[PDB]
Amino acid sequence: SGAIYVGNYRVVNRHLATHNDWANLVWEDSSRDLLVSSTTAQGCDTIARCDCQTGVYYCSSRRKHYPVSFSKPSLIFVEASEYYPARYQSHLMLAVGHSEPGDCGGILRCQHGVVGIVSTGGNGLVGFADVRDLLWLDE
Numbered sequence: 001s002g003a004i005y006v007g008n009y010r011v012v013n014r015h016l017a018t019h020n021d022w023a024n025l026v027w028e029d030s031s032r033d034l035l036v037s038s039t040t041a042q043g044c045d046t047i048a049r050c051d052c053q054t055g056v057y058y059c060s061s062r063r064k065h066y067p068v069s070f071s072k073p074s075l076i077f078v079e080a081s082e083y084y085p086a087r088y089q090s091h092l093m094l095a096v097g098h099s100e101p102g103d104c105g106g107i108l109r110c111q112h113g114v115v116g117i118v119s120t121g122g123n124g125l126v127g128f129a130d131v132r133d134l135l136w137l138d139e
């Protein structure tokens, strides 16, 4: 679990969104595993606007942060799960690292701010849904 709070927006994994996220929907994209909902309180986070390919992410299943090198956002095949059929997920960045069920929502950050959130795992890999291209989160 986990979310990004920026301005009057809450960014979560689409497959973990709650009834309240859907009742306050701003934007969602099943192909990216993202959903953004509106909040009444001002958020705690700032978004990176950069091309970093190294950063640090939080892994809840180990209660620790790990440094990673990750690929540029791309279209990657993701196997069928109880949340989605087998499909290509877009704007996804892979890295070698630990990720198990429950780790989705962990934040990946670089020196410029939040880069994205954990969205895929298994096989000694961790995949992150990029948010750096969503410029409207800042306004």
Ligand SMILES: C[C@@H]1CCCC[C@H]1OC(=O)N1CCC[C@H](C(N)=O)C1
Pocket (backbone or CB within 6 Å): 015, 033, 078, 081, 083, 084, 089, 099, 100, 101, 102, 103, 104, 119, 120, 121, 122, 123
């Ligand atoms: C994080 C899990 C670790 C063990 C192996 C499976 C890993 O699950 C996943 O990669 N997904 C399940 C939830 C939905 C994700 C998505 N963005 O489509 C894909």
Ligand SMILES: [Zn+2]
Pocket (backbone or CB within 6 Å): 048, 049, 050, 051, 052, 110, 111, 112, 113
């Ligand atoms: Zn950066």
